[PDB]
Amino acid sequence: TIYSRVLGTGSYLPPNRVTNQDLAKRLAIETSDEWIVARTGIHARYFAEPDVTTSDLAFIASQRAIEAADIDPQSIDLIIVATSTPDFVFPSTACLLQNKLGIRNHGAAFDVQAVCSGFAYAVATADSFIRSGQHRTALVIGAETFSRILDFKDRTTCVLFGDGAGAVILQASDEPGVLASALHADGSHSNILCTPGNVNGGVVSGSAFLHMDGQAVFKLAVNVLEKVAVEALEKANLSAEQIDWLIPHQANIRIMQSTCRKLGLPQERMIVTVGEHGNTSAASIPLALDVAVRDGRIKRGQNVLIEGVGGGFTWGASVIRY
Amino acid sequence: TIYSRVLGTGSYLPPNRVTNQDLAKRLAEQETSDEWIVARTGIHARYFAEPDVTTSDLAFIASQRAIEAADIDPQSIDLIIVATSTPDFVFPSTACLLQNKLGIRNHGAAFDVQAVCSGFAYAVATADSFIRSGQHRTALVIGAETFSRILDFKDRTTCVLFGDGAGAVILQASDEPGVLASALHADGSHSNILCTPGNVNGGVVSGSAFLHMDGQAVFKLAVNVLEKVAVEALEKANLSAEQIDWLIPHQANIRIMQSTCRKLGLPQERMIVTVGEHGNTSAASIPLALDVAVRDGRIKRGQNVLIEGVGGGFTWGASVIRY
């Protein structure tokens, strides 16, 4: 009888807007604005200065969520950050974010790793903590500086990912926002989307650059996204026709249009930011959520479906009554 | 109505047992001794993975051993949470790699959580929450580290202290409590005193990818919070410190452990101690000690176990588990 309601949203993009032309010139390896749009639907993305970290981005998005929620920062008793580019090996980004916000209440703070499905994982976890009574007000973040793990000699991937942060404040409520979530993983497909390295004795071992088999990822993606959306919708006792807004992970326009069509929704019911944001992994969904809440598309009482896939393979979905 | 019960435990140490003398001789080609390390820490040995052996490799063996103890079908595990701060890769997650190593084909959720040396408490509390609600039924919960990868062997303060290893539990929905309660906390204002302050950026390491620590500040913080969080967790499980049959702290060093135990008013013989042989294996610490003490018959069904630790963050947490 306790539910998690969205009190506020916030987001942030770092100031360097990098257009397709900017990127094509940079490599000039051969690519173009036309080629990138045809492949992905992306026109621009945003890169942090290499000096600026995931928690920096997270801080500003959180501040803006806190403002929308209109709450005392000291009332946030849980922070979960979904990221795959944390500031440090340890401690966690959430811990750094806690201190940046000046929160002194000793509340739990941790990071979760499910890559581009990270925010679904983070939402479902917070929701579970709030529903049980254990926490009351959670700050849930998706944040990435994916420019730090891009190989700019690889046009397959380096024109695809961007940086950014999005945040939501969830609070105990007698009335549902978060109705249901479904999370999944299949580690047999780890090889087709991976950044296969880490630090070892001071030096990088393996490759600390993102690699991807785009064709395999696409087929897997469309295959699971349909199923998990249905499972989630069933778990929330809702039908596809009752979805007022679809917010997929902003991977690329064609995976997004496919999913939306397979659900039988009209394309006008889907929030699309990939064109301006690119693929910001865990940040993707809460960026789009924030944009669409703040521009008045998403209204109180409406049913929102978030879903995505990511490295792992992982995938997950949530049905949220805003 | 639904509780999480421990069906089985398992653990693993890599084969290279590194004694204090082995390590002293090593840094003598670089300064320390067996006596200095024992006096400081209570440590006599620790175990190092080969540099080509990863956290998920260690996790695999510990998990298999839990699965064996649980006596369940591997395909029935519908949740995998790994606590680690030394995952195999930037991504994907260790839990995903572990899933495939175990040949689990049921598409269950798999993810990693980061709370450093408090990781296992964080992981247990998250799994517990998922099982209690009905969302998941059988969870594999891992603490696993290859902390040798982030040690500076020119720093005698820290490089004699940490080790590698993995420990695992299977939790399952039950009408009778094992996990009675958990309390988790964090204070990021103390991030600077215990940190590995770097990461990868454009192919190279930026910052320092080596663990640093202000031992004195960590100790004082540790003893201060461990007493409080134990009590909070015990209250939340409707128990008192005198109802604890076994205390299993994060195996940081013998003196923080003895302090905590005394401050709870327990005798020292009610505390499981593995630091001497395992060293500080961060998130792997508690489930290593859990496994050792379950399998040598100390921890018996029906007994109340308190697990408690602190780590980088600062983070800390506790759990009260009726075995």
Q: Domains in chain B and their CATH numbers?
A: 1-175 (3.40.47.10), 176-323 (3.40.47.10)
How many Cβ atoms sit within 10 Å of the Cβ of residue B17? 13
Q: What is the largest CA-CA distance in chain B?
A: 60
The first and second tokens of residue A64, run together, are 């803006």
The first and second tokens of residue A146, run together, are 């994916």
Query: H or E element: which one contains A27?
Result: helix A20-27
Cβ neighbours of residue A81 under 8 Å, at least 6 residues apart? A54, A58, A92, A93, A94, A97, A109, A110, A111, A112, A122, A141, A142, A143
Which CA distances in Å does B195 have to A88, A89, B188, B208, B249? 8, 8, 11, 10, 20
Which CA distances in Å does A15 have to A12, A22, B257, B318? 9, 14, 48, 42
Residues in chain B: 323
The first and second tokens of residue A312, run together, are 């792992």
Cβ neighbours of residue B105 under 8 Å, at least 6 residues apart? A186, A188, B75
CA distance A87 to A109: 15
Residue of chain B with shortest Cα separation from A207: B203
**For chain B, what is the radius of gyration of the CA atoms?**
18
The first and second tokens of residue B75, run together, are 């395909």
Tell me which method was used to determine the 3D structure.
X-ray
DSSP string, A117-142: GHHHHHHHHHHHHHHTTS-SEEEEEE
Whether B304 sits among the annotated catalytic residues: the reply is no
Cβ pair B187:A98 closer than 8 A: yes
Cβ pair B90:A85 closer than 8 A: yes
The first and second tokens of residue A109, run together, are 């703070």
Classify the phi-psi angles of B116: left when phi > 0, otherwise alpha if psi is within -120 to 50, otherwise beta: left
Bridge partner residues of A276 (DSSP): none
Place of tokens 């003398």: B21
Compute the nearest-CA separation of A28 from chain B (Å).
19
CA distance B21 to B2: 50
| Beta strands in A22-161, from DSSP E residues, in sequence order | 44-47, 78-82, 108-113, 137-145
Q: In A, which residues are within 8 Å of B184 by CB distance? A: 108, 110
Cβ pair A50:B185 closer than 8 A: no
Strand-pair category, A314-321 with B3-12 = unpaired
Q: Are A277 and A239 in contact (CB under 8 A)?
A: no
Bridge partner residues of A200 (DSSP): A203
Strand-pair category, A78-82 with A44-47 = unpaired
Identity at B199, one-letter amino acid code: N
Scanning A168-294, the segments in alpha helix (DSSP H) are 214-235, 253-262, 274-277, 284-294
Cβ pair B150:A199 closer than 8 A: yes
Whether B117 sits among the annotated catalytic residues: the reply is yes
Compute the nearest-CA separation of A296 from chain B (Å).
33
Which one of A110, A184, A204 has the shortest CB-CB distance to B203? A204
How many Cβ atoms sit within 10 Å of the Cβ of residue B152? 17
Bridge partner residues of A45 (DSSP): A18
DSSP string, A284-303: HHHHHHHHHHHTT-S-TT-E
CA distance B129 to B181: 10
Cβ pair B96:A185 closer than 8 A: yes
DSSP state of A14: -
Cβ neighbours of residue A226 under 8 Å, at least 6 residues apart? A259, A262, A263
**CB-count burial class (<10 Å; 0-12, 13-18, 19+) for A256:** buried
The first and second tokens of residue A24, run together, are 């094509």
Strand-pair category, A137-145 with A78-82 = parallel
Tell me phi and psi for residue A60, to 5 degrees.
-70, -40
Identity at B41, one-letter amino acid code: T
Resolution of the experimental model, in Å, one decimal = 2.3
DSSP state of A318: E
Place of tokens 């993102």: A210
- Tell me which residue of B98, B85, B92 sits closest to B139, measured CA to CA: B98
- Tell me which residue of A127, A89, A134, A136 sits closest to A111, measured CA to CA: A89
The first and second tokens of residue B34, run together, are 């067996």
Compute the nearest-CA separation of A308 from chain B (Å).
14
Chain centre distance of CA A191 = 21
Q: Which of B96, B185, B253, B280 is catalytic?
A: B280
CB under 8 A, 24+ apart: contacts of A259-267: A259/A222, A259/A225, A259/A226, A259/A229, A259/A307, A262/A222, A262/A225, A262/A226, A263/A226, A263/A229, A263/A305, A264/A240, A265/A240
CA distance B244 to B319: 12
| Coil, strand or helix at A248 | strand
Q: Are A127 and A181 in contact (CB under 8 A)?
A: yes
Which one of B104, B187, B313 has the shortest CB-CB distance to A92? B313
